[PDB]
Symmetry: D2
Subunit: 222 residues, 4 copies
Amino acid sequence: HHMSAIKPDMKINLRMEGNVNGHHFVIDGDGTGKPFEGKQSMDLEVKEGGPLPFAFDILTTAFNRVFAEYPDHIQDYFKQSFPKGYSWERSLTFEDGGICIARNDITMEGDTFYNKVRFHGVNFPANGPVMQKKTLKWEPSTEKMYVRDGVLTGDITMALLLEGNAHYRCDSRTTYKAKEKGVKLPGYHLVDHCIEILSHDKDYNKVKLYEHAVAHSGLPDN
Amino acid sequence: MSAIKPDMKINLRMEGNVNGHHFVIDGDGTGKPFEGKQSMDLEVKEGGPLPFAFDILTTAFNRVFAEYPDHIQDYFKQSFPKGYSWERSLTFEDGGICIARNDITMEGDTFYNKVRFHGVNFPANGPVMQKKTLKWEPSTEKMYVRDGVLTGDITMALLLEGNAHYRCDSRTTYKAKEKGVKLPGYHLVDHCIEILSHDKDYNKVKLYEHAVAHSGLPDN
Amino acid sequence: SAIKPDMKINLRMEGNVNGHHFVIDGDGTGKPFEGKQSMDLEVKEGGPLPFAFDILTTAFNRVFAEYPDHIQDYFKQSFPKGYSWERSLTFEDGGICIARNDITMEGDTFYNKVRFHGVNFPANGPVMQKKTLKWEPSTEKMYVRDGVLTGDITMALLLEGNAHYRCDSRTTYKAKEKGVKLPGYHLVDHCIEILSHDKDYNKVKLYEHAVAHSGLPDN
Amino acid sequence: MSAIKPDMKINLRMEGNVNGHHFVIDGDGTGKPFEGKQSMDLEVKEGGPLPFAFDILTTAFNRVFAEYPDHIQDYFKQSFPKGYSWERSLTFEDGGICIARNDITMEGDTFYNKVRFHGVNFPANGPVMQKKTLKWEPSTEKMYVRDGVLTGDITMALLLEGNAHYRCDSRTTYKAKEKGVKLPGYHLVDHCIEILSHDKDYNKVKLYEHAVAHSGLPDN
Ligand SMILES: O=S([O-])[O-]
Ligand SMILES: O=S([O-])[O-]
Ligand SMILES: O=S([O-])[O-]
Ligand SMILES: O=S([O-])[O-]
């Protein structure tokens, strides 16, 4: 409908501030990605509150659905929200009562996406896998995208693999809102995700993160 | 070892109660277990016409009908000849809650399904009692082990009139009849279910499902 | 008028938890206006039960609640014709139960047709391992939703080792007769107790006390 | 001698963000810890007029203000002079979700409250963004120990215009600052909370709460 100004190779700048279980932190991010291939990588550095007393994994989905491969037949709300950009709000509900909220305001200047991220988490039990740092990774997921109360909404059944091979369940709901008027809303669709910490130092003060995401219509034609 | 044929017949009897309304539904169909495809003709034998949306029942009418790749353990085909059973909760966003069970056995080239379905707390003016549902959207079941039992969780959504959606969370626990059947690792199962045809009051329904198991990105 | 100060209670429950079928008969007595009732239960089929008896006990009638004059008593007003209820029980470890009761009256006896189904209880959870001790006293929040009287409760089972096991209850209550006036928002305090039982819980004596009120500061 | 005096003052500063809207609210109040009664005058310092229902904030503006009987351990009065902190989640039935924190300290006759409040996913057409709330109904908080921490769960409801209700589930975790403060057994805390008065835009609000601990039936 208009030129997004999104290049096949983009830079990513990010600042997160937040508080989990009373512990304040600031984390900076610098990365690169390929929006049309749905792939991105980022180097993160804890600037305040290091070392973190909680599992770094709970934060990683808060570190942009622009980085998702959208096929021609599915409306791409995220790429169409640029150059102006968009924002999202998210709740994360963990099976043991831990609850997080998160926000990201996403803008673009030239070849770089800028991200102002906030993350707040409460009610994580002392001996749960989050405060005990017993998480290994997020398992691959599928986000369900649909218009709810006039707003594009993504719901996800997520699972963290734990040490000892158990899983730890988290339900995610994200609301996505374009900054500019006139962005077409998509029909129901699915977005496959996989996210991975490629490397980190001992205290997770420095972390290299990667995501791959692909939009599709599900069976039978996916 | 499983004795599962490339073409199988399916016999089904469901009895249940939703909102205090009792019903009995018989099913006769055929499927291709290794293609993850199946079809069934359903007939309401008691309780017709149903005062609620037929769609709430349809996932209760067998993960044997899922295409499993070699690298993922197929718990369901490995549960035969002896068979398996499942229990399910369906939690809808307006407080409607269903439970369902199915005991699955096999005799020759026919699967037998003893199905029970109970639903409570559906609001009088919600999309279920008002029959405003159109279809289940395609879904992806998350398969994992919890307390020694294979468990599938799904973020499901019913398409409604006007292209609204009505959310339902599914949890299924699957248990082989035979002791010591090997549990699979974490995996995904893509699903799509469709009422191909029905009469006006949904006393007669033709149902279809396609399901494929996979490892998610980046492999799938 | 229809309901007497001393009433008798007849009950038949049929159900299935974890794939295990059972039938339980009940005979008891209660004082509706005092909100008190007692019942002797007997497992007729499926004994000994392989799960915690405690999960069943709220399924074994809000007629047995003391309602003050300033709150509409939907339940006593539903007789002689009677009423029905549907319930979901959502336990914190994924166990989910649904239950129904059709309540009728003839003479001085209430009759209860009860159904109870439970799924997805973990093998090593407190229910399948029978590690529950009692329900803690609760308060049911009563309100109207989509024309129907609804009760929500944050409940808790005390377990061996003194931990608690959380359950959320939603009940929908429906009078048989049309035109029964719905109450305003109110609270109902409950306490439920197994007074006695044999080793396998094939025979159980159950007791409940319930009192309706307006909450602080008027309670 | 006692850290808790019959008549105490309350100073409070809340900062927060609901649906992207930043705000700062100051409070000055007085209360009677032993009678479980308190009142506070609140003033929106930044972000007025608030675009959301003020009612969602009100339980975030101290369980020291609760009448505890002799037979129930009073964790909150035992937490002073050093103080305590709480974290809370508020889960509304339409997907709006809030988290809040309060760090409570004491100097002389005054409690000091550092409060943070964050809310997301409230729909534009819902009662919160539409400002259609009237009051919280009277509630009963269920207090119990989980993983060594005092925890309170509440089935809450806002009364709406037209006399419908809007449900919210609250979980609070309470933690004394000092080591070795004895945890109480299971108990109930009754609450009622009321906006006594406000100006048109809720830039100025006078708030009141009454709370009483008890053991439930038959004890109460
Ligand atoms: O991002 S994927 O490689 O987990
Ligand atoms: O079974 S699918 O085509 O909905
Ligand atoms: O019924 S009360 O005594 O638990
Ligand atoms: O404190 S009460 O009056 O809502």
